[PDB]
Nucleic acid binder design. Structure first.
Ligand SMILES: [Mg+2]
Ligand SMILES: [Mg+2]
Ligand SMILES: [Mg+2]
Ligand SMILES: [Mg+2]
Ligand SMILES: [Mg+2]
Ligand SMILES: [Mg+2]
Ligand SMILES: [Mg+2]
Ligand SMILES: [Mg+2]
Ligand SMILES: [Mg+2]
Ligand SMILES: [Mg+2]
Ligand SMILES: [Mg+2]
Ligand SMILES: [Mg+2]
Ligand SMILES: [Mg+2]
Ligand SMILES: [Mg+2]
Ligand SMILES: [Mg+2]
Ligand SMILES: [Mg+2]
Ligand SMILES: [Mg+2]
Ligand SMILES: [Mg+2]
Ligand SMILES: [Mg+2]
Ligand SMILES: [Mg+2]
Ligand SMILES: [Mg+2]
Ligand SMILES: [Mg+2]
Ligand SMILES: [Mg+2]
Ligand SMILES: [Mg+2]
Ligand SMILES: [Mg+2]
Ligand SMILES: [Mg+2]
Ligand SMILES: [Mg+2]
Ligand SMILES: [Mg+2]
Ligand SMILES: [Mg+2]
Ligand SMILES: [Mg+2]
Ligand SMILES: [Mg+2]
Ligand SMILES: [Mg+2]
Ligand SMILES: [Mg+2]
Ligand SMILES: [Mg+2]
Ligand SMILES: [Mg+2]
Ligand SMILES: [Mg+2]
Ligand SMILES: [Mg+2]
Ligand SMILES: [Mg+2]
Ligand SMILES: [Mg+2]
Ligand SMILES: [Mg+2]
Ligand SMILES: [Mg+2]
Ligand SMILES: [Mg+2]
Ligand SMILES: [Mg+2]
Ligand SMILES: [Mg+2]
Ligand SMILES: [Mg+2]
Ligand SMILES: [Mg+2]
Ligand SMILES: [Mg+2]
Ligand SMILES: [Mg+2]
Ligand SMILES: [Mg+2]
Ligand SMILES: [Mg+2]
Ligand SMILES: [Mg+2]
Ligand SMILES: [Mg+2]
Ligand SMILES: [Mg+2]
Ligand SMILES: [Mg+2]
Ligand SMILES: [Mg+2]
Ligand SMILES: [Mg+2]
Ligand SMILES: [Mg+2]
Ligand SMILES: [Mg+2]
Ligand SMILES: [Mg+2]
Ligand SMILES: [Mg+2]
Ligand SMILES: [Mg+2]
Ligand code: NA
Lengths: 92, 54
RNA sequence: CGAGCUGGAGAUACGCUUUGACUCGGGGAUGUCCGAAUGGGGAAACCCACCUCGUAAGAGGUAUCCGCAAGGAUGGGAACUCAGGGAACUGAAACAUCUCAGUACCUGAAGGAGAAGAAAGAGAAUUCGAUUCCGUUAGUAGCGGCGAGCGAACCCGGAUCAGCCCAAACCGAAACGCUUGCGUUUCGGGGUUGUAGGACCAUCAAGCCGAAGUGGCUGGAAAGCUACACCUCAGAAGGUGAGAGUCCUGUAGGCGAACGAGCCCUGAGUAGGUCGUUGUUCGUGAAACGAUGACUGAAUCCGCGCGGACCACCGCGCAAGGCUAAAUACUCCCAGUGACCGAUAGCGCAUAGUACCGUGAGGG
RNA sequence: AACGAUAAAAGAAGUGAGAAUCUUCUUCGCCGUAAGGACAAGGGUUCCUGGGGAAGGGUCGUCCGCCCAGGGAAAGUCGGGACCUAAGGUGAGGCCGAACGGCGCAGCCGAUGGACAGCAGGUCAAGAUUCCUGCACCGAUCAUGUGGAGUGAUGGAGGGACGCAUUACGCUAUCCAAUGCCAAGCUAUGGCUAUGCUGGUUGGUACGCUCAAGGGCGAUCGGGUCAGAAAAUCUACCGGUCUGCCUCAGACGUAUCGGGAGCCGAAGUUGGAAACGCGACGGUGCCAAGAAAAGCUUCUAAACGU
């Protein structure tokens, strides 16, 4: 259910500095909405969510082998928690 | 209880996916094994649907 | 099946497998969104809902037309079938009739085929005996600005052959219909036609088993040369460092599974007619017959239709109800084969409806 | 032949195998109702970072809108949808038609229009009414309390609801002057010793017995059935009935959050100009006579209570 809505954490120098603000950034399945994405984050990590934002992101159009390539297509979501700002501590 | 048996493999597949996005995915096979165990665990449910109820 | 496997993928890490993996044959179960699309909307694959399940996450339903209801339909198919429509270049050495041709094209319906089919026929022997297909008749008979040109059928020989049931005269109803044992449509029995009948009265599958050769020589390499052998129901073929009957896969032959596919009546707004037309060889011709668009409109078995205006005689047949396998066509798909190609050939493609061109249809 | 406008370029310094062409510095020339800036269509990663140098670049190339990889894109309040309607498109029933199809009321779709709640700043290498800080507003559900009863529809009414030209008053944006204020230093060339030169010289919000042009409005008691389907305490008709209220554009003050030249934070004055923007749906004239629907305000019908 909730486990496989969440995709994989963003790994970005910008996203990791936000890690220090209590802000957490990770990709999700694009067809999901904010309401379910929030209850997914907080069913999974046990923490109140007070701020969501989301954004569809096109797949880059890479080309291998001189066969023109395609997109990939994602939906990064950024989330701010309550003052109980822990996750799994797994930040680095 | 079978939903309980399923979501444990789901959560391990999620945290393992996170690890794959980071710097450590040293046993890729544990991925598809877990996915196997989900499919099996659902396929067995199908066999208790038609069985009994007819 | 019996050691490999982890798609092409050729690149590692990771594993899985003799409690049988992988691969092959056969079933199940999952099956996002669009698309007949069908909950409502929509610029396909995206927006927006409602109702019961209801703990949630998730599931199930919500189009229309047929029908009480089950249950059915809608869409999609390379060509093939039938149907509703229906060209023109062209030929006629110009062009109107005519041809091209009921060809192309469009549209509808259906299937593995389809159509057609069981004589009011063909036809001239008082012969024949449903339909379709092939041969021949025969380019004959005919049609035709009697020009260009178009062009049958019967007999006969073959492929395959099967014939079948309803309506109605009369029984018995029931319901309704009216002056009193009747007649409009349902349901049974009965009854289905021309030598007139009938009523009422006396094997293919996945696969498994499968014979026979060694030494020297040339050579990078043996399958070639050579010398001695051997099998043969098996010398079809492909692979193997170059040309292999006896090295491999195979071949002739043999076996081969749980589930697997497969032969008093006999039809009326009709038959018939006048007007317009048309189909078969049928172009208004002496033009019958079938066919409907308009208006009319019969007869019963001593009766009805036809036999190419029409009449008499003589013959053939029973219309206005339905179903019907097989011989026929085609080739998206599979197998085999080839005095077919072998890289400007062969399909457009040794793969691509791609790149590329176009607003598009479309081309490529 | 050409190398795509006759808007010039020069030197120094750097990087590199390599430099007229890449980077830096200092000058020069060109646009400036543009050749600057912000959007819509359309394009689709062209954006930023780090690398590269085949080809693409009309030369070169260490560079690029080219190639490789990694990041970047945040909304209750902006634009669209979950609201409305226009032309147009659809369209159960319905009207037609050899077939396919052609029309068509209601209804539905359809923005180029209507309705609708946020402003100031900060700032990644790359996002900003979106993230952050300050401080607001809007709908919905619930709770506490006041209130302690009427709510008041797929239906009625009002209203939304609209032309063109011209133009009175007031104002802001915004622009100018100065021996106003504030900050910084210097000066030479012949002079000025600052009365010179240079630069900056306020944004949002909250509260005012503050100043203020302009703009909106009449208002109830009752009669009639024949009007709005019936209803109606709301509208429309008709009859009786007596300058003043509201609004702040904007300015001013106080406070506060910001910003501010600059070496953390100074000043925030007086005088003048001025919009097509705002007050506003103002005034006047004219003929060619200037959308609809929802939201919104008001009434009962049914139902639910009191
Ligand atoms: Mg937010
Ligand atoms: Mg095997
Ligand atoms: Mg391989
Ligand atoms: Mg739909
Ligand atoms: Mg549908
Ligand atoms: Mg359905
Ligand atoms: Mg002609
Ligand atoms: Mg001719
Ligand atoms: Mg002609
Ligand atoms: Mg054809
Ligand atoms: Mg067709
Ligand atoms: Mg069809
Ligand atoms: Mg014969
Ligand atoms: Mg051989
Ligand atoms: Mg030999
Ligand atoms: Mg008969
Ligand atoms: Mg007739
Ligand atoms: Mg005639
Ligand atoms: Mg003639
Ligand atoms: Mg006759
Ligand atoms: Mg006739
Ligand atoms: Mg005769
Ligand atoms: Mg050849
Ligand atoms: Mg070729
Ligand atoms: Mg060639
Ligand atoms: Mg082609
Ligand atoms: Mg194009
Ligand atoms: Mg194109
Ligand atoms: Mg030139
Ligand atoms: Mg230079
Ligand atoms: Mg050097
Ligand atoms: Mg060089
Ligand atoms: Mg130059
Ligand atoms: Mg440059
Ligand atoms: Mg320097
Ligand atoms: Mg510009
Ligand atoms: Mg765009
Ligand atoms: Mg974009
Ligand atoms: Mg750039
Ligand atoms: Mg850069
Ligand atoms: Mg770069
Ligand atoms: Mg180069
Ligand atoms: Mg290269
Ligand atoms: Mg070059
Ligand atoms: Mg958003
Ligand atoms: Mg906010
Ligand atoms: Mg809006
Ligand atoms: Mg609408
Ligand atoms: Mg209309
Ligand atoms: Mg229409
Ligand atoms: Mg608009
Ligand atoms: Mg708004
Ligand atoms: Mg910065
Ligand atoms: Mg930018
Ligand atoms: Mg901002
Ligand atoms: Mg003025
Ligand atoms: Mg002065
Ligand atoms: Mg000054
Ligand atoms: Mg009231
Ligand atoms: Mg002041
Ligand atoms: Mg409406
Ligand atoms: Na001096």
């Amino acid at each position: 259910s909730h486990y496989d809505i969440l995709q994989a954490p963003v790994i970005s120098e910008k996203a990791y500095s936000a890690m220090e603000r209590g802000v957490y950034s990770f990709w999700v399945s694009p067809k999901a909405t904010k309401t379910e994405i929030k209850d997914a984050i907080q069913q999974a990590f046990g923490v109140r969510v007070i701020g969501i934002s989301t954004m569809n992101v096109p797949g880059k159009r890479k080309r291998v082998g001189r066969f023109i390539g395609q997109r990939n297509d994602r939906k990064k979501a950024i989330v701010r928690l309550a003052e109980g700002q822990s996750i799994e501590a797994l930040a680095g | 209880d079978f939903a309980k048996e399923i979501d444990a493999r789901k959560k391990e597949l999620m945290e393992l996916r996170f690890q794959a996005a980071a710097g450590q995915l040293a046993q890729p096979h544990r991925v598809r094994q877990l996915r196997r165990e989900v499919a099996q665990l659902n396929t067995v449910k199908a066999e208790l649907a038609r069985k009994g109820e007819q």
